[PDB]
Amino acid sequence: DLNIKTMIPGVPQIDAESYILIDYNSGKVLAEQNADVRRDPASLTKMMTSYVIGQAMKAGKFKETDLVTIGNDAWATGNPVFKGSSLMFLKPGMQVPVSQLIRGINLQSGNDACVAMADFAAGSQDAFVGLMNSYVNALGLKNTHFQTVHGLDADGQYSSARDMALIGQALIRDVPNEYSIYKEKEFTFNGIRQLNRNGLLWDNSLNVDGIKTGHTDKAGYNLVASATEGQMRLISAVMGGRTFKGREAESKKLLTWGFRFFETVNPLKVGKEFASEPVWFGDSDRASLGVDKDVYLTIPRGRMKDLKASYVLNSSELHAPLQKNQVVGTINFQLDGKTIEQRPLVVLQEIPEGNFFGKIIDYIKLM
Ligand SMILES: *C(=O)[C@@H]([C@@H]1N=C(C(=O)O)[C@@H](S[C@@H]2CN[C@@H](C(=O)N(C)C)C2)[C@@H]1C)[C@@H](C)O
């Protein structure tokens, strides 16, 4: 009858030590297990490296076509610390376009390429790690600290499924030109073809434009994945997966589960009037009320027509002056009579005080 419509879906068991599934637009956590346990991120570290780089290029600090000259510290076979790790095989003296180095970072997980771009972007690796951890602070991540540009095992570096899912959200949102690289399945440098090890890119059942893989014998098998269905986008991060086949199978389970049982809705957009309230002492009698940021809600799929919204005002009356985006109350979104999310009710257009004097006196005073 209606137990169907109010059904909570069982969450599938996940053969991973830590995971999280979130909606990209709404931020809603659909499923989680040990999402805040600090773990080693392995090459998921390179998501942040890519984020810092994308911010730099966004700010015009360098271009795709600028040629980086490879220094001694990015010499692949000149630094045995790189042994047994993925590399794009850079040698001192080469001039490699920025567009190729970031593809070594994102697609081949090339640790030498991270060193190349770090010195280029920030002058040194320490400076670049400083940018990384500063963006950790700027994004409000609470279980993430970086000590390398590549994600080779550093004793004091860690992250979490939630923080890595939030880093992936930040990538898609803040630096989309950089994020659009992760869907490329193959990249060739210096006559060596290497594959993007995110096998979900190959899965036709999903529209995975994918993020980053990572694996060390201490981290396990890590993968941050993102897919779309229509205009809904989900993000999954599993850490401590058992095998390469295991981490992708589990991630895919979360993404199809999330898509099948939940949907994302956009019930109100910025600048569209949600409500109207009288105003006192103003040049306008009424205030137009809405949101300063588009509302995205994640609800059970099919239940959109059952979504109801209402609002409360912080004060009994509204007195001018009122500014653009001044918060005067709360919008309540309810499903089945229960409030499922709130977002601030704000003034859509500033409303100054009365001032009804001769327009010319006004000018004259200025003049
Ligand atoms: C990041 O976690 C490390 C790097 N990244 C990956 C990955 O993209 O999944 C692994 S996979 C790579 C595939 N073949 C293995 C190998 O023996 N070599 C040397 C290429 C590893 C890899 C560990 C990064 C820190 O190195």
Residue numbers in the entry: 31 to 397
The article reads:
Despite the success of beta-lactam antibiotics in the clinic, it has recently been shown that an alternate crosslinking mechanism can lead to the bypass of PBP mediated D,D-transpeptidation. The L,D-transpeptidase YcbB (alternately named LdtD), with remarkably few additional accessory factors, is able to undertake this recovery of PG crosslinking function, even in the presence of many clinically used beta-lactam antibiotics. As with D,D-crosslinked PG, the bypass pathway initiates with GTase catalyzed polymerisation of PG; the resultant growing product strand is acted upon by PBP5 which catalyses a carboxypeptidase reaction targeting removal of the terminal D-Ala5 resulting in a donor glycan-tetrapeptide substrate for YcbB. In the last step of the bypass pathway, YcbB catalyses L,D-transpeptidation using this tetrapeptide-containing donor to form a DAP3donor-DAP3acceptor crosslink.
In addition, we report in parallel, the structure of a PBP5-meropenem acyl enzyme complex in order to completely describe the molecular interactions which facilitate meropenem inhibition of the YcbB and PBP5 partners. Relative to previously published PBP5 structures, we were able to trace additional residues at the C-terminus of PBP5 (387–397; likely afforded by the differential packing with a neighbouring molecule in our unique crystal lattice). Meropenem binds PBP5 in a typical PBP fashion using the conserved SXXK, SXN, and KTG active site sequence motifs common to this broad class of activated serine carboxypeptidases. The meropenem is acylated at C7 by the Ser73 side chain hydroxyl of the SXXK motif (the proximal Lys76 of the motif playing the general base role) and stabilised through an extensive hydrogen bond and electrostatic network. The Asn141 side chain amide of the SXN motif hydrogen bonds with the 1-hydroxyethyl group on C6 of meropenem, while the Thr243 side chain hydroxyl of the KTG motif forms bidentate hydrogen bonds to the carboxylic acid group of meropenem (C3). The latter is further stabilized by longer range electrostatic interactions with the side chain amido of Lys242 of the motif as well as the guanidinium group of Arg277.
